[PDB]
Design a protein around this ligand. Structure first.
Ligand SMILES: [Mg+2]
Lengths: 272, 271
């Protein structure tokens, strides 16, 4: 029995210690992956993939990922990890590769070209593509998505983090999170070889361990890492875009083009 | 200021792989030994002969041995070098671009690019060009020379791109590409971009370049022999079209027939 996708919920816009131009990340949507290198922190996105977020939370709370491995890692591509097995406790999910575009959705359009989509921009701090009917998350670097088999509804336990942009995967995979801290540790993960079992790390060697995985909500509040994200629908966010397009430093005797790759735009995200 | 010399064409000596491949000359292979493993880089005197010669001189003088990747910003660049003033190594004239030659056999990428009107490949390197000039692209895993605001101030300290930094194109001397050990570059100790521009702070130190050598400094049978596919040949198109045309039923939404010039992998093999 494949688990059907539930209805999406827009991300909370609760004001934080910062101005009304920022939103609090809810603690249940913060995942802390502890590796020997340090902690990888991820913001989950139930606005695009509520079914996968719920599943991920369940597995994390159930300690299902503790001691598991990033068993498949290809440099410059993705770092993939999970239970590396089928478990009757965790049946497959319906794919959540895109969502209906809603009238309430406040997308900040990026007013320069993109190679893969006619329209790209930002929605609640996440990079997105959209058309008249649909919206989807972009496979920018540091995005969390669910691995699957050829049939779309086969994902549900094993995930990957993008090491570089993989835009060709857009609208074919369930993206349900983004890295907000510790991306450097993802980059330290033991690599496999793409020409050997598709990057699966081979015996006698094993991928680096997920020593523990928790939700911030599992910690007592006074130990919870408090994160806030700039609201990308505000005028203040444009600077984060115009700083990369308009480069006036005398360093440049050849003025750079007024263009920025949507996946290079950094959304202000701060620990509070 | 050391003036820039005339560019020199890359060797097209055929290898074990055949006439559609070229051997990389050992003098144009740099081996950076880290605690993680070896980073190998192919130098490009076709674009930056002056910087290549300088870099070769410093490597042979063992000037980089025991030095650090002292400035590293995740997703940006890993910068290393002597991190000091040295009278032995005066600044070089910038080599940020070269005249486009009719003899240049550029393989044009026939899809859009965000930063340049024409992009493609020249002797296994990503390039941009117009009517008059050609330049190397700041794709990931490219080696370039750090400098100050004045163009002719580079010459000792270099950086390796961790991700594409195309906005730097035509403003910096790019003079090499990583051909092996990119994963080790990604393991390098990081600094913090909001603290001294990513310079790693005491008591911590950047990871050490334990040794830096040219392959040519080794005896022939210990030299790593690398060959690169000639990008002007028809065989190279697959490396492009494999990523543009994805017909696998895995994709129920067929990807657009487009590839970022910096995502194209030029066949490069150890033999
Ligand atoms: Mg990139």
């Amino acid at each position: 029995k494949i688990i059907p996708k539930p209805t999406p919920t827009p991300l909370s816009l609760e004001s934080g210690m910062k101005g009304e131009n920022w939103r609090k990340i809810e603690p249940e949507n913060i995942v802390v992956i502890t590796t020997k290198y340090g902690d990888i922190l991820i913001e989950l996105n139930p606005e695009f993939a509520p079914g996968h977020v719920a599943r991920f939370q369940d597995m994390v709370k159930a300690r299902a990922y503790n001691g598991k491995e990033f068993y498949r890692v290809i440099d410059g591509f993705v770092a993939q990890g999970g239970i590396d097995a089928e478990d009757k406790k965790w049946p497959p999910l319906e794919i959540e590769h895109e969502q209906p575009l809603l009238e309430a959705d406040q997308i900040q359009l990026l007013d320069n070209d993109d190679l893969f989509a006619e329209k790209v921009g930002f929605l609640n701090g996440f990079p997105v593509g959209f058309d008249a009917e649909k919206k989807w998350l972009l496979h920018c670097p540091g995005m969390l998505a669910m691995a699957r088999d050829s049939d779309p509804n086969t994902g549900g336990t094993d995930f990957y983090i993008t090491l570089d942009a993989q835009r060709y995967l857009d609208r074919n995979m369930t993206v349900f999170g983004r890295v907000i801290s510790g991306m450097q540790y993802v980059q330290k993960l033991q690599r496999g070889d793409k020409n050997i079992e598709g990057g699966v790390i081979q015996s006698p060697n094993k991928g680096d361990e997920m020593i523990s995985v928790k939700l911030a909500s599992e910690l007592p509040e006074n130990q919870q890492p408090n994160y806030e994200v700039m609201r990308t629908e505000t005028a203040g966010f444009m600077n984060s875009i115009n700083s990369k397009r308009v480069r006036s430093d005398p360093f440049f005797f050849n003025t750079p083009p007024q263009v920025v790759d949507v996946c290079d735009v950094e959304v202000p995200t701060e620990l509070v």
